[PDB]
Design a protein around this ligand. Structure first.
Ligand SMILES: C[S@@+](CC[C@H](N)C(=O)[O-])C[C@H]1O[C@@H](n2cnc3c(N)ncnc32)[C@H](O)[C@@H]1O
Ligand SMILES: C[S@@+](CC[C@H](N)C(=O)[O-])C[C@H]1O[C@@H](n2cnc3c(N)ncnc32)[C@H](O)[C@@H]1O
Ligand SMILES: Nc1nc2[nH]cc(C(=O)O)c2c(=O)[nH]1
Ligand SMILES: Nc1nc2[nH]cc(C(=O)O)c2c(=O)[nH]1
Ligand code: SF4
Ligand code: SF4
Ligand SMILES: [Mg+2]
Ligand SMILES: [Mg+2]
Ligand code: NA
Lengths: 209, 209
């Protein structure tokens, strides 16, 4: 059984796969914040830009099993087109993403990405692992495809993240009332430390979901 | 001898390497347009967003040999940092980019990308080949790392391009008076035909060179 906030078809806005058509499956619920505003200031992750509470978004709901969820995901892909790609997010997708769902998505011809905060172990059969560490949470996933660090965060040891086992090391400016400022900080960081590259939230500039 | 409009250090704004720190080396001169506005209306390539005339830009000049040019490119890289990366562009870089320059950039620890219109043979020792075909020019480069097609162009056969031997197939919206329109067309093209992914000109959104 899966609790899903919304499922939608768009381009991946972030990370190395930015620009790529993807079905986004947004699981409800996170382990670093309740999703309630009155809780935000005391939460482990306090900067979240996302509504992951409940199952009331587009295509959202409680799915009986993996086949029902996969059916809805596949249904959003253009008929007769391949390159099927799903980005599992949330919320924290590792609270709910399990092997039977991964196997059913693979059997349906999807490549699978995850967006995860890195505080929970990941399924290594996932094809694309994006880890976005939250400075005040544990980081237990220390290898993956891309480490996409939102900056600035207090308590961050940013340069050290670069010792972890990832193919790409990205900084993503924190959105909120200081986005332009954070974007300038992020560009400068990369130019001074070019192991790192910039991940913009391109979907916000394109005004697409 | 090399005629170079400008050399600057920034983030690659475009293609699959978007976000990556790079020295841009912009060669002077193109085979598809004189760069003169009086000639634009009759040129093979008519939509160019770039000034590639003369050697009067930042660090631009006539370089006596490869060593000279590599010296200036290397001097823009942050001291003590690796991941050296240079994007050769212009203008049409294949008018001037030769094996000695490729060999000296490589000797200096640079990975080398090119931005090329594809109408001229490219050197296969170049590490990253980005081909952006112009609808009314010959396309002789039919393999490479990314094929980054600016859209829309009249006379374009866009689905045919996807038959070529590239790792990535991208559409980039044509900037000009219709950029927003063109951006929506490009998003829609990728969602309908998801072999294709979007290449935004992110440096224009970031307002960086
Ligand atoms: C909403 S999270 C969901 C997946 C999981 N909780 C995680 O944090 O990766 C998806 C991506 O958005 C990023 N993000 C969240 N709030 C953001 C903000 N205000 N500015 C920029 N990126 C943000 C997260 O760091 C993560 O990389
Ligand atoms: C300035 S060109 C120089 C390299 C080579 N002459 C070429 O055309 O690929 C670099 C990139 O800018 C793209 N470009 C030029 N004018 C553009 C415009 N108005 N809108 C979007 N992309 C543009 C080109 O297609 C190319 O991919
Ligand atoms: N287009 C788009 N790209 C995204 N990449 C990560 C997102 C997320 O919410 O996990 C997201 C999102 O919400 N939209
Ligand atoms: N930041 C940035 N990225 C770019 N990618 C290709 C460019 C070009 O002029 O070839 C370009 C450019 O001029 N600036
Ligand atoms: S860990 Fe991810 S989903 Fe949870 S509050 Fe933070 S950014 Fe949002
Ligand atoms: S071929 Fe490249 S440099 Fe030449 S005019 Fe066209 S976009 Fe500009
Ligand atoms: Mg989001
Ligand atoms: Mg340019
Ligand atoms: Na900090």
């Amino acid at each position: 059984t899966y609790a899903v906030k919304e499922i939608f078809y768009t381009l991946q806005g972030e990370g190395a796969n930015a620009g790529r058509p993807a079905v986004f499956c947004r699981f409800a619920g996170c382990n670093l914040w309740s999703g309630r505003e009155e809780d935000r200031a005391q939460a482990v992750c306090r900067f979240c830009d996302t509504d992951f509470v409940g199952t009331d978004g587009e295509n959202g709901g409680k799915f009986k099993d993996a086949d029902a969820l996969v059916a809805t995901i596949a249904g959003l892909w253009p008929a007769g087109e391949a390159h099927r790609f799903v980005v599992c997010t949330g919320g924290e997708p590792m609270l709910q993403l399990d092997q039977p769902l991964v196997d059913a998505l693979h059997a349906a011809g999807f490549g699978i990405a995850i967006e995860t905060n890195g505080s929970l172990p990941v399924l290594e059969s996932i094809d694309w692992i994006c880890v976005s560490p939250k400075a005040d949470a544990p980081l237990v996933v220390t290898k993956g495809n891309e480490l996409k660090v939102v900056i600035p965060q207090d308590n961050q040891r940013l340069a050290d993240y670069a010792k972890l086992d990832f193919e790409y090391f990205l900084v993503q400016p924190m959105d909120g009332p200081s986005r332009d400022l954070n974007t300038k900080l992020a560009i400068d960081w990369c130019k001074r430390h070019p192991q790192w590259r910039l991940s913009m939230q391109t979907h916000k500039y394109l005004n697409i979901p």
